[PDB]
C-alpha cells in the first residue's frame, strides 16, 4: 500500500510531496496549474486528493505542484 | 480571409504567426506534443496547419514549428 513496486505504476499510497518537499496540487484542482489529468477521465488511475501517482508510465510517481513556478515533479516513494 | 471579432469562425488558410513562424499542423505532435487533436474537436476545423481559434481565445493561433516557441497568435486581417 505505501511503498513502491517498480516504477510506481501500481502505487496507491498517500505521499503528497515532491522529491524536494513541495506540496502536490490536487488532481481535482486546476489551481494553481491548469491540466488535463482529470480523475473522472481516468478513474482506474487512483488520481485522488493530491497524492503522488504515476498514471502514465513515467519513471516514478509524480504530481502537479502548488508552487506557481513548478508545474509538476517527481515524488520520492520508498522502493518496497 | 480576414476575420470578424475573435476568429472563432475563421476558416482561412493563413499559416504563420504574428512573427513569421510556420505553424505546426494540428495532426502532428512534432515539434510539440499537445491535445488539440482534430478527431477530438472535429467541428473546430483543426484543418492542416491553418491558424484557428477553437478555444474562445483572443484571436487565431497555432503551435509553432520552432521547438522553442510552443504556440503564438496569428495576425489575421480584420474584415
Amino acid at each position: 500500500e505505501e511503498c513502491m513496486h517498480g516504477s510506481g505504476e501500481n502505487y496507491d499510497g498517500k505521499i503528497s510531496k515532491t522529491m524536494s518537499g513541495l506540496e502536490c496540487q490536487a488532481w481535482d484542482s486546476q489551481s494553481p496549474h491548469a491540466h488535463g489529468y482529470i480523475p473522472s477521465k481516468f478513474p482506474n488511475k487512483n488520481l485522488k486528493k493530491n497524492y503522488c501517482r504515476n498514471p502514465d508510465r513515467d519513471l516514478r510517481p509524480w504530481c502537479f505542484t502548488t508552487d506557481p513556478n513548478k508545474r509538476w515533479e517527481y515524488c520520492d516513494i520508498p522502493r518496497c | 480571409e480576414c476575420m470578424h471579432g475573435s476568429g472563432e469562425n475563421y476558416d482561412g488558410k493563413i499559416s504563420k504567426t504574428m512573427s513569421g513562424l510556420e505553424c505546426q499542423a494540428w495532426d502532428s505532435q512534432s515539434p510539440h506534443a499537445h491535445g488539440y487533436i482534430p478527431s477530438k474537436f472535429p467541428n473546430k476545423n483543426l484543418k492542416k496547419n491553418y491558424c484557428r481559434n477553437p478555444d474562445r481565445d483572443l484571436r487565431p493561433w497555432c503551435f509553432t514549428t520552432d521547438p522553442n516557441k510552443r504556440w503564438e497568435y496569428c495576425d489575421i486581417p480584420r474584415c
Binding site: 491548469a34 491540466h35 488535463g36 473522472s40 513556478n69 | 474537436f41 478555444d55 481565445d57 510552443r70
Partner: peptide, 26 residues
C-alpha cells in the same frame, strides 16, 4: 462541466496561457 469538449477546450487554453506567462517571467 468537466468532461465536455468545451470544458476541455477551456483547460487546454488555460494551460497554453499559463505556460506562456511563466515563460515570460522566467
Amino acid at each position: 462541466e468537466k468532461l465536455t469538449a468545451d470544458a476541455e477546450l477551456q483547460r487546454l487554453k488555460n494551460e497554453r496561457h499559463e505556460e506562456a506567462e511563466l515563460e515570460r517571467l522566467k
